[PDB]
Design a protein around this ligand. Structure first.
Ligand SMILES: Oc1ccc(/C=C/c2cc(O)cc(O)c2)cc1
Ligand SMILES: Oc1ccc(/C=C/c2cc(O)cc(O)c2)cc1
Ligand SMILES: Oc1ccc(/C=C/c2cc(O)cc(O)c2)cc1
Lengths: 235, 235, 235
């Protein structure tokens, strides 16, 4: 290839490596904001026509993102204060990024997950809502969408599918999630979604389980991967 | 240097950054497959002359990988069903990659680790084998080998060295691993390895401990690192 | 742009991607060393005029780093032996890197965090100091400084701000940290810091909380981010 072909090929390859970093950074930054109950910084990560999906409900735009992370999560955990605050733990450990940039470099998908250690210390337990566990673990999978807007990566769709909860004292095997897929929309429900997902995308919560399909192709076999050939070797 | 020297140097540097991403992606993808008890997708990540090492035993090729992840782990946790399934948690959180690409770019090593949250919900506990903990934590270190085959990175050797287990209710300090280094080979043992490791590589399990040497050089001092100079400053 | 402008721009972009990898590798390598109570390898990661900060106290140079990781942590957990050792767990799971390289490429900052699973098995509990929990969780945030010295990235300042502790049996909501911000300097205190932080940087420990400001700019809005505009949308 010519020097011009090689320079252009290197520019495209280096942009894709930068894109992957930038998308990972959005999720890791998102984590550090939500650990502090700081919904503004979270809302700022989104494209203006973006959305967040939580318990099979869509929260649209800056308004929806502030309703979920502010009106609901902040009022629940800190009584409507930017955190962190005395005795309140809400650590959403973020990991295991598998990001796929579209061929055109203008959109992307990414799989991630979180494990949360949460709760109210004995010092502040009188501030905990009746009905909330004092201390708990949660984990869920993210399958998110991203857009590159005027050369900046932003969150287009954050889709958090909670997978399991555990009361600290009892564990996942003895815990039922009280949170269930959304049934009531905003404004009837002041902390509810703009719209429910379609029935085919509605997920029941722990201990109910459903696959979250991979946004990534099989990294070795791509579309050549077929389950059945391998299954023949199992007993 | 000439434009040709600079282009070739940039091509090699950008390939090495892509190689590191690709190798990390194999381990993160491996994780998301094993969380769903999907052994086929796991087997597909391996070179055909690859192997997996588990409890000081080698399982060779697609056949061995399907025996460990299918005949053993899938039959144990889901009764031989592709997951996920109701009430069954098997989340192997993957992290802390330190990858070393060979100078020739055709092989690699990588250190990783996993922490597992596992168990049977009360809803399905009657499906749990007698003798298994209802709910547990495990963690282990991976020191893996990779090959670049026809321009695609694949797993050559996955070596998972379990380090500790904890019953959920009691913790690591009160838990003994029932799993011990392999003693019986397939086919006598229908879920056993093709071959045992050599005695010098056999690891006893928690609370027994043994170092897993680092596949990476000291990242600041490389071969110039010597323990004793520093030890002089400790009291 | 000319071929020369494009080559130089690509060299700078590829160096920045390599820099980010190298800085992440320091923290991940640091983790694997401290899990083995190997302070020498930790000390080797530091610039000679580097420091480590722990409980609002600065430990300067190789001498200080060996005092904290050797004289204190190694003597505490393994009785002054390089690990790992029978029945002693000290796994500092490292994750969630957000690294910012200075424009000149000669320094960097990075946010990270750790979650620790620690303790003495029943087999060795008679070796545990009176007053230590047999088994516990801890987590903290790192905001670190790095220098590129003769083309090698090194730790200039490791600042570990412990955020929460939990006795295994009781959880974070029922645990008070016994560790408090440093009050006594070395040499009066044989395991104490060279210097205390200034009062304005002193942190009280769990369940006391204080923000650890982000070393990174808002990744979408940068300095254009303002909290108040968004807060208007919350109820
Ligand atoms: O073990 C557990 C049992 C119940 C729960 C409830 C969680 C919860 C979390 C939210 O963010 C909002 C909310 O309204 C409820 C969590 C853990
Ligand atoms: O706390 C614990 C006590 C015992 C165990 C046993 C684990 C185990 C895990 C496997 O994948 C297969 C198996 O046959 C056994 C796990 C946790
Ligand atoms: O639940 C917990 C209660 C107390 C502690 C104390 C921790 C500790 C950790 C160190 O590295 C050194 C030390 O002198 C003390 C930890 C956990």
């Amino acid at each position: 290839a010519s020097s011009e072909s090689r320079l252009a090929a290197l520019e495209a390859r280096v942009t894709e490596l930068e894109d992957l970093n930038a998308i990972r950074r959005l999720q890791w930054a998102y984590g550090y904001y939500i650990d502090y109950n700081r919904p503004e910084e979270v809302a700022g990560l989104f494209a203006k026509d973006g959305a967040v999906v939580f318990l099979s409900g869509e929260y649209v735009g800056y308004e929806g993102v502030m309703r979920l992370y502010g009106t609901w999560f902040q009022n629940l955990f800190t009584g409507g204060r930017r955190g962190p605050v005395h005795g309140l733990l809400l650590d959403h450990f973020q990991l295991q990024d598998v990001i796929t940039i579209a061929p055109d470099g203008q959109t992307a998908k990414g799989r991630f997950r979180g494990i949360l250690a949460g709760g109210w210390h004995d010092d502040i337990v009188k501030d905990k809502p009746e009905g909330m566990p004092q201390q708990f673990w949660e984990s869920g999978i993210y399958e998110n969408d991203y857009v590159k807007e005027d050369g900046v990566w932003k969150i287009k769709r954050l889709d958090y599918m909670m997978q399991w909860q555990a009361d600290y004292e009892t564990g996942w095997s003895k815990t039922i999630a009280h949170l269930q897929p959304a049934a009531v929309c905003f404004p009837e429900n002041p902390i509810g979604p703009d719209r429910l997902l379609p029935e085919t995308e509605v997920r029941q919560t722990w201990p109910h389980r459903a696959e979250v399909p991979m946004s990534f192709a099989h990294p070795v076999l791509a579309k050549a991967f077929a389950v059945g050939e391998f299954t023949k070797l199992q007993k």
